[PDB]
Every structure is written in structure tokens, then in C-alpha cells.
């Protein structure tokens, strides 16, 4: 039978994202809007830096800026922790270690506000090099594609993951971003704790030619696999 949280995602769902950030004391805010259609694993979003110039590269924020929109195959629907936690939601925490540079620590709450799926994030970055690849804006604005291994965190009644993002640098090299993630439910209701599996994500980054604010347009597809 079709689960409680899963039912909230059968159509197109409006999304709001809000991030407050502080990287080496450079404070900024980002707002995003768009839609998710989990039946196809499909996200369409536009993000705006509401405080002026973004002090870090947009690509470094992509993973922080809603795995609840993954397409889970029918035979894997008992492994979808993310939708099971809805509408009350989940806390998503990460540490992102940029090799030979600083780290982000993020804490987000992902939940419904009425019909809208909201991702509210606080991001703190420390120990960055002021002329490194991040604060020096040396990263290319590229498509991002990966496969993240999700595991149960039974003691926290949630999930964990660790994965690498390799950001292309303008000189042809790679800036590694090592991600460590833990998610836990906000409410006290039952959730689905998954067997080991993957989320495969493809993200295309673009610009709105009519937009004068610092911004990012994102088209993303997210699909579960590996069972």
C-alpha cells in the first residue's frame, strides 16, 4: 500500500529554499524557488543571492541547497527515508571538507509548510584561504553528476552518507569536497530505515539572461538505485 509521506509527493510540489551563510566572516543569504516532481526525480530551481555578490562559488553550495524528491523505484519504496519523515520533516547535517582549504558545516530542516516543501539552512564556513579556490572564485560553473551511497543510522533513527564532489578548477585541476552527512527525523513518528542503496544525481547549472542579481538556475534529476 502507498505510505503516508510518499503520498505528499505524487504530483508537482512547490519548493522554497532559504540559506543563511557565514564563510570566514563573509555573511550572505540565498533564496531559491521552484518545483519538484518526485515521480520523475525532477527539480527545477532558481537561486538568488539576496545580499549582493555571493562570496563563494555557486557550485560549492549545490549539495547544500532536497533528497526527498528522489525517484524511488517501486521495488525500493520501503527504503525512502526522506519522504517517510514528511510532513514533519528531517534535520540534515553535513560537514564538507574542501581539500587543502576550509570546511562548511551545515544544518538544515526540510519539512512541509502547507503545500510547500521548505529547505531552511544555516551554513558556517571556517579556515578558508582568502586566495584559495573557494574565496578566490577559481571554480568552473559546470554540470555536477554523482552517485551517493545511503546507509541506515539505526541508533539515530535516520540515515548517513559520505561522498566526494570533485569541482573543476579553472586551471584544469580538481577541488575535492569530502561530504559527511547525517539525517534524523524532526517528528516522533515512524520512519523507513533503508538497506544500503544509491542516489544518482545529475545537475545542470545555468544563468537567466534577464537576471541582474547574482544567481543560479538548476535543473536536477535524482534517482534511487542499487537494490
UniProtKB/Swiss-Prot annotation:
User: Which InterPro entries does the record cross-reference, listed alphabetically?
Assistant: GFP, GFP-related, Green_fluorescent_prot
Q: Name one GO biological process term.
A: generation of precursor metabolites and energy
Gene expressing this chain:
GFP
Result of altering residue 204 to V? In EBFP1.2; shifts the excitation and emission spectra to shorter wavelengths and increases quantum yields compared to BFP
Effect upon mutating residue 101 to E:
In mut1.27; shifts fluorescence lifetime from 3.03 to 2.85 ns
Q: What is the effect of changing residue 169 to V?
A: In EBFP1.2; shifts the excitation and emission spectra to shorter wavelengths and increases quantum yields compared to BFP
Mutagenesis or variant effect for residue 222 to R: In Azurite; shifts the excitation and emission spectra to shorter wavelengths and increases quantum yields compared to BFP
Quick check: keyword Repeat in the entry?
no
UniProt's post-translational modification comment states:
Contains a chromophore consisting of modified amino acid residues. Maturation of the chromophore requires nothing other than molecular oxygen.
Recorded coiled-coil stretches: none
Q: Which family does it belong to?
A: Belongs to the GFP family.
What is known to happen upon mutating residue 204 to K? Abolishes the tendency to dimerize and leads to monomeric fluorescent proteins
What does the UniProt record report as the effect of altering residue 66 to L in this chain? In EYFP; leads to yellow fluorescence, folds faster and more efficiently at 37 degrees Celsius and has superior solubility and brightness
- Outcome of mutating residue 40 to N: In EBFP1.2; shifts the excitation and emission spectra to shorter wavelengths and increases quantum yields compared to BFP
**Name of the protein in its database record:** Green fluorescent protein
Q: How is it used?
A: Green fluorescent protein has been engineered to produce a vast number of variously colored mutants, fusion proteins, and biosensors. Further generation of mutants led to more stable proteins (at 37 degrees Celsius for example) with brighter fluorescence and longer fluorescence lifetimes.
Where are the bilayer-spanning segments?
A: none
Q: Quote the annotated effect of residue 66 to N.
A: In R10-3; matures to the red-emitting state with excitation and emission maxima at 555 and 585 nm, respectively
Consequence the record notes for mutating residue 147 to K: Increases fluorescence at warmer temperatures such as 37 degrees Celsius. In Esmerald; leads to brighter fluorescence. In VisGreen; leads to brighter fluorescence
Q: Which organism is it from?
A: Aequorea victoria (Water jellyfish)
Q: What is the effect of changing residue 47 to L?
A: In mut3.3; shifts fluorescence lifetime from 3.03 to 1.88 ns. In R10-3; matures to the red-emitting state with excitation and emission maxima at 555 and 585 nm, respectively
The tissues where this chain's protein is expressed are given as:
Photocytes.
Gene3D superfamilies, alphabetized: Green fluorescent protein
Q: Name one Pfam family in it.
A: GFP
Q: What does this protein do?
A: Energy-transfer acceptor. Its role is to transduce the blue chemiluminescence of the protein aequorin into green fluorescent light by energy transfer. Fluoresces in vivo upon receiving energy from the Ca(2+)-activated photoprotein aequorin.
